[PDB]
Design a protein around this ligand. Sequence first.
Ligand SMILES: *[C@@H]1O[C@H](CO)[C@@H](O[C@@H]2O[C@H](CO)[C@@H](O[C@@H]3O[C@H](CO)[C@@H](O)[C@H](O[C@@H]4O[C@H](CO[C@@H]5O[C@H](CO)[C@@H](O)[C@H](O)[C@@H]5O)[C@@H](O)[C@H](O)[C@@H]4O)[C@@H]3O)[C@H](O)[C@H]2NC(C)=O)[C@H](O)[C@H]1NC(C)=O
Ligand SMILES: *[C@@H]1O[C@H](CO)[C@@H](O[C@@H]2O[C@H](CO)[C@@H](O)[C@H](O)[C@H]2NC(C)=O)[C@H](O)[C@H]1NC(C)=O
Ligand SMILES: *[C@@H]1O[C@H](CO)[C@@H](O[C@@H]2O[C@H](CO)[C@@H](O)[C@H](O)[C@H]2NC(C)=O)[C@H](O)[C@H]1NC(C)=O
Ligand SMILES: *[C@@H]1O[C@H](CO)[C@@H](O)[C@H](O)[C@H]1NC(C)=O
Ligand SMILES: *[C@@H]1O[C@H](CO)[C@@H](O)[C@H](O)[C@H]1NC(C)=O
Length: 154
Amino acid sequence: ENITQWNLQDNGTEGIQRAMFQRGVNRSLKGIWPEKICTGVPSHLATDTELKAIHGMMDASEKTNYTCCRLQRHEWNKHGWCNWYNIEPWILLMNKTQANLTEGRECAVTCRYDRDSDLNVVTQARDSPTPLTGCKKGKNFSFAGILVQGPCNF
Ligand SMILES: *[C@@H]1O[C@H](CO)[C@@H](O[C@@H]2O[C@H](CO)[C@@H](O[C@@H]3O[C@H](CO)[C@@H](O)[C@H](O[C@@H]4O[C@H](CO[C@@H]5O[C@H](CO)[C@@H](O)[C@H](O)[C@@H]5O)[C@@H](O)[C@H](O)[C@@H]4O)[C@@H]3O)[C@H](O)[C@H]2NC(C)=O)[C@H](O)[C@H]1NC(C)=O
Ligand SMILES: *[C@@H]1O[C@H](CO)[C@@H](O[C@@H]2O[C@H](CO)[C@@H](O)[C@H](O)[C@H]2NC(C)=O)[C@H](O)[C@H]1NC(C)=O
Ligand SMILES: *[C@@H]1O[C@H](CO)[C@@H](O[C@@H]2O[C@H](CO)[C@@H](O)[C@H](O)[C@H]2NC(C)=O)[C@H](O)[C@H]1NC(C)=O
Ligand SMILES: *[C@@H]1O[C@H](CO)[C@@H](O)[C@H](O)[C@H]1NC(C)=O
Ligand SMILES: *[C@@H]1O[C@H](CO)[C@@H](O)[C@H](O)[C@H]1NC(C)=O
């Protein structure tokens, strides 16, 4: 039921995707998304110490040199607190997921079509199929180097 999305490395994409490439990171968790978007004041303000426990998840913000915790805190604030109620379960889930991603079903979400390699370079992916964005029709996909015929590797 919850969408799990992550960034993939790409030198061609400015931001976390280039940062991940430069650092040899292939997958960095974006979020775990239930249907409900949290609006208003969080039940608990997430601490950098609590967020840094999501080992492997690089921050999407340059203002922390793609480390922690703007994006991590964004996730807690936007999709976290109103669905999990307490930071502990959320931290434990976010962490296990990132770890699974770090340690090796992945559908493309957004591509950057590279003309020099005739490839749909996957910049964001998820655990379920989704309408693609910026993916050229009929071209192969590159999921952090892995070449796949379809938009999903399953
Ligand atoms: C998909 O996404 C949904 C969210 O939309 C998610 O569902 C949520 O799952 C979390 C757990 O992962 C669950 O959170 C618990 O909620 C209950 C109340 O509903 C709380 O009691 C829990 O907190 C736990 O208890 C502590 C305090 O409580 C007391 O203290 C003692 C401690 O000695 C405990 O043993 C007892 O529980 C006692 O009552 C808390 O302080 C701790 O944090 C502790 O974990 C959790 O907060 C939510 O209810 C679910 N919400 C919904 C909407 O479903 C689901 O897991 C996701 N699934 C997947 C597969 O991704
Ligand atoms: C992390 O990876 C493990 C191993 O692939 C997942 O565990 C399996 O999950 C399936 C489906 O949920 C279960 O039926 C199996 O019994 C589990 N096997 C093992 C060896 O653990 C786990 O679900 C993954 N967790 C996350 C959050 O991605
Ligand atoms: C977060 O996940 C990591 C894996 O990415 C877990 O790492 C372990 O850290 C503790 C020491 O702090 C030990 O169990 C091992 O040295 C680590 N194991 C591995 C495989 O790296 C960590 O347990 C997780 N933390 C939380 C809070 O879930
Ligand atoms: C990565 O991109 C930068 C800027 O576009 C470029 O100068 C560099 O040569 C690229 N490196 C690789 C290995 O593609
Ligand atoms: C950003 O991080 C990388 C690797 O951790 C490092 O090369 C760089 O110097 C860091 N700091 C700044 C300010 O760029």
